[PDB]
Ligand binder design. Structure first.
Ligand SMILES: N[C@@H](CCC(=O)O)C(=O)O
Ligand SMILES: N[C@@H](CCC(=O)O)C(=O)O
Ligand SMILES: N[C@@H](CCC(=O)O)C(=O)O
Ligand SMILES: N[C@@H](CCC(=O)O)C(=O)O
Lengths: 391, 394, 390, 396
């Protein structure tokens, strides 16, 4: 079996030929799942006989077979990624929109910063633009923490304190409308890891985002967090209103919960790391790169459902109709995009349109679904003129 | 090729019923339009009970492609009898919910027994199953809303249609002075004004009728005049809407509102059965292609938009919860029918008269929750990791 | 006493001297209450103590009350001069757009402006074009509400309609108030439920006749036809009310809408309409005929709702600033009531953005700005305002 | 002149007889306007008899003759006070039999008041006084202070400025113009609070308002409950939410400390009055800014006009529209169970019972107000010339 891949790649094969063929499939040599194989190549170090090849490739053979036999959701990645660069370049030319000035940290970012990162459910990676520049999740974290809550607590409990539908502060039942709005996000924040101090709660959530991202970059911006606390009049009013209406679980410290809320909003990521988080959501709770199970299918289901209707702010309904993909946006200019069973994505540009969404990101998401059939209600069998990367 | 099949069915001669029996186990019905030539030749040959390589080849030759897929288990649900058995359990479970109230606002709806319950399944490959009362005619009512909206977009395209109507749910008119969506009476009335403009109601009606006939694979589609007359007597609500829409200039130029309402009431009065309606849903799940006729009815654009709205707006006020828990595009009506669509897989019609507080069929809502609970068909369920759920696609 | 009045005026009084003095009191010789006196005068230039008392004796109470300065506004000539100033100041506002939704309304000249005043004591003043007939439109809403309450009582009337502002149906599933189309449509269904539509219309007409002291009241079939031709909003409301069962059982909703349109199509003039207002200000008693048209209950409720609901969307602001119960209509008329003092009809065609007459509103502000007539103004300490009652 | 009066009330007048006649007018011997006359009677009584003669009466009533003349000449707004007084008692006794309602428990201070407490105080525009029930028991103004502090703002700042930050009409937190609907809602009151006495500390603001309330009450009891204030600022989640929202929407004037304003707000709610003291405040409103008993001008006619217009529509909470339609009087209520009632040009009142109904208004107060208008024509839109079964205390 290790020998087949060998012939598939002629008495002896050079390393760079095996590596290039590997990178071709969309995989990265730094992939955690390939670690054992890459450790061996380190020791071996130029030409590989049947024996040496089999020696290094053993542990990781199953994953390597899938890549080379093109079993991945997108068999031809190189062509698909070329399309991604087109859409990226196409969106790059939209200079409209406004960068958030409400805090110095948001205003400091250049409007020209633009990047897109793709991570499939099989771990295939592609990046273009500025994908390595750290930025705060802001509202993009709302789906993530909601997932954590539903994962730990469960659906029945979590929705006792919050609503499952769009709006149009509280609903008929005196619950916030959903987890994707500040009022609802705040309540969700109070549900996580009850009984411990903010430090531990924050360590717990942080560990969780690390799992979703396959231990890729996750960080915290204290500068943003501090300015978030000073300008938080809007959220304080909500916090007091929730407290008054008894929306919080018993024993809750409201003023403290708000600071945790601001902390979570100040969490830093990159297009690349975030795309892995979205891929976990598209992969049913399993981190595509690490293969580990981060979230229960129940949590991922609920989150994608609410990201669908509630994710884009006031542009949600429009977005659900035209784009048909679950997504979440934040004032940093990030858009966390998920294509179920296919991939996950993070688009980042600071300038936002009048509705609070990234101009480029929105332009990119539209073109994406126009090009391929990722639309939730697109038909796999008959898509018309659309392109299916899965074939 | 045809010979390959013949071998799959041991001895030199095949009993004619053996082939038919094995055929049926696929969920396919011998009356299937795509099977006519095979079945015609089969009874003609049977006129002059055994088959041979060259005989079975003579009968199956014309339809060979479909037969192969059926016997090779290439259909979306490869094991139909298993999936079928589950459907019955779900049906049998929902049958035990006797709650709900049959709609009395007109004599026609009130006449129906609370105990009438049935479900029909038509997959994207034309696989068929029914249990309960699937042969009883009933009006679509609001179930027609998505169907006539699909027809509008198909002919007029998206830009034009939604110029007069909204694409989202509602907490009469939205901020743009348009009905919130096609799934509400106001929106449905405007959609009705868009179809087949410039002609009389009789022509418009026939235009939609043939259209529904295609979606149903020429299965039963009918009209209840008794319901139509009652509908137009009791229509104060919809008449109020018509004048408001007229006042707010929500109709295409040269529109007769009173005439549109009449067309509207007729479209609600169009009647079907669980079985024929199941094919309708399947066509929506098939991307616009009628599963049993293999014929193109609606454009992928029209079908997509229709499913998008059935997701959010289809369930009345229970839409938000239905979308969250069930996660399937569906439409409900006062007759107690629920038009259900599982994309890429199948479509159904669940019909019971008794309605809940929301106006949705009690047994239908129950059945849908169980279906998605049992199976991974939920919109955001994962095709790779579904946990405890079942995947009938294997 | 008729002797008394005589010396108040030589051994001989010429009629013109008596006639001039009387007009000065704000009264008209055409006044229905002075009919007997005026009959005698024509039945007879100069006259003595005996001939005077002969003509005057029958009206002596009103005449003595007038000449003794007992009328609500003792000095009318001054007050009249102020009304003219306000009229002239408002005359300079040409902004506003005449209502075009029907031909009849669009025909009216933007420059048509008039003000009529009728006190509770029958004093009359008019300036501008006060003799020109125009449709009451929404100005009739309080009038037909007063009629309803009068006949049916407050308890019955308010099962079908709300008592307060809005900001179609309230929580109770009733129209918010009588001053909005939805409510006026329901109110219209309450009146004379037994008879046919022709008799109903006659009944209201006669009622409006008493209210106007038998002054001009008329009907425009032109407006009525145009009105019913475009009813879509009002038909929309009608069907919604019918569906919500907001009408009294046995009602023909569609027939009612006809009646509704007819009522909006009734014609008045600034002068005749000002009397209608004066009746509302006088507690249901027509100032000039001394007759009792409306119950004090109907008048109280009517003035209450005109206060909050009368001005369309400008009602709240009008109540806060002007502080007078009033009703406005699409024809550009404003039915103004100053309780215990007088009543008025301000008419100019051009509407403002809120649907109220531009000049009319301008006039109402200056009036309350100049005088203490504001609802919550204090009679004792009003500061720099004028009190015409003194 | 003083002689005329002397006769109209033998060759000599017993002092108690003059005192008994004066009290009949509804006036009080404690009337600040009567002090000179009253000091004289006491002094004179020392230097002599118990009996008074022409020359002597001339000595005592000389200074106050004007007011005394109008009292004995039946020229007060209500000529027969004792008949009217007799009626007020009947209404009080009728309303007293309504045992429904729940006393506000949201803080300890309100719950401590017994449900049985019921009282009504009347002060006419001429200073005529009547009280029945418990009118001497102190209680916090609460929302009853809303129109008062708003009047102070309009008096100092005028209408145009004050209403930039607040709406002039009912609701149905912010209106279409992004302002609080009116001064009578917590959101509006909090904004009105920010307008008063800017540039100075809370202790100064509080004193400035306090002395203003003293004028309106004719220097009768005005007090502060710290027990209630502390409880108020612990329970203020609702108002803190509003404050932050107001702060976010830029509703406050420049350089405004919101948390400091909320504290000032709670203090104003905690100010204590009695039915008798408060009734005088209401009468000052009915008198057009003049305190009936002191004859002093507290507020501008403009300030009072606006306040009454808003009390009319916005004063009763959600019962405002119904109240305005039936009762037809400007009024304000508070969680303490007090109702500040004003009859323009006639009198002013304070009705107090702790138990509140579903709408937050005291059952007894509301019941009383209804009977009050049923009996007499005080309705804003009642006619002075024509009323049906109603009686007119202003008529002889
Ligand atoms: N930290 C901000 C982010 C707002 C947003 O991204 O929409 C908040 O929670 O209000
Ligand atoms: N024809 C009925 C259908 C109602 C419904 O199914 O919701 C109507 O327009 O009211
Ligand atoms: N006849 C018009 C009158 C509108 C108005 O006067 O404001 C209607 O009923 O709508
Ligand atoms: N002082 C409390 C209650 C006022 C009241 O409603 O009486 C507040 O401002 O919320």
């Amino acid at each position: 079996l290790e020998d087949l891949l060998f012939y598939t790649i002629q008495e002896k094969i050079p390393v760079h030929k095996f590596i290039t063929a590997l990178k071709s499939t969309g995989l990265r040599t730094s992939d955690p799942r390939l670690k054992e194989c890459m450790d061996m190549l380190r020791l071996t170090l130029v030409m590989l006989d049947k024996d040496l090849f089999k020696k290094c490739v053993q542990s990781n053979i199953v994953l390597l077979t899938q890549a080379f036999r093109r079993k991945f959701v997108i068999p031809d990645f190189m062509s698909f990624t070329s399309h991604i660069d087109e859409l990226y370049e196409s969106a790059k030319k939209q200079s409209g929109g406004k960068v958030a000035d409400y805090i110095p940290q948001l205003a400091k970012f250049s409007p020209d910063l633009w990047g897109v990162s793709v991570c499939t459910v099989d771990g295939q990676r592609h990046s273009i633009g500025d994908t390595k520049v750290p930025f705060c999740l802001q509202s993009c974290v709302k789906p993530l923490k909601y997932a954590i809550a539903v994962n730990d607590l469960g659906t029945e409990y979590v929705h006792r304190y919050v609503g499952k539908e769009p709006s149009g502060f509280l609903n008929e039942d005196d619950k916030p409308h959903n987890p994707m709005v500040n009022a609802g996000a705040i309540v969700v924040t109070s549900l996580i890891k009850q009984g411990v101090n903010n430090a531990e709660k924050f360590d717990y959530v942080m560990q969780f985002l690390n799992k979703m991202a396959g231990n890729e970059y996750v960080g915290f911006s204290n500068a943003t967090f501090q300015s978030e606390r000073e300008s938080g009049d809007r959220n304080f009013a909500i916090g007091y209103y929730l407290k008054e209406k008894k929306c919080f679980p018993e024993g809750t410290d409201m003023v403290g919960i708000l600071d945790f809320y601001f902390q979570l909003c100040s969490i830093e990521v990159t297009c690349e790391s975030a795309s892995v988080m979205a891929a976990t959501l598209a992969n049913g709770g399993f981190c595509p790169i690490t293969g580990e199970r981060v979230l229960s299918p129940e949590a991922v289901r609920n989150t994608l459902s609410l990201m669908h209707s509630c994710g884009m702010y006031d542009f949600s309904g429009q977005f659900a109709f035209h784009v048909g993909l679950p997504a979440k946006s934040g004032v940093a200019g990030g858009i966390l995009l998920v294509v179920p069973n296919v991939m996950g994505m993070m688009c980042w540009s600071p300038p936002l349109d009048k509705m609070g969404n990234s101009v480029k990101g929105i332009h990119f998401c539209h073109d994406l679904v126009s090009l391929c059939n990722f639309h939730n209600y697109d038909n796999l069998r008959h898509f018309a003129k659309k392109l299916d990367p899965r074939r």
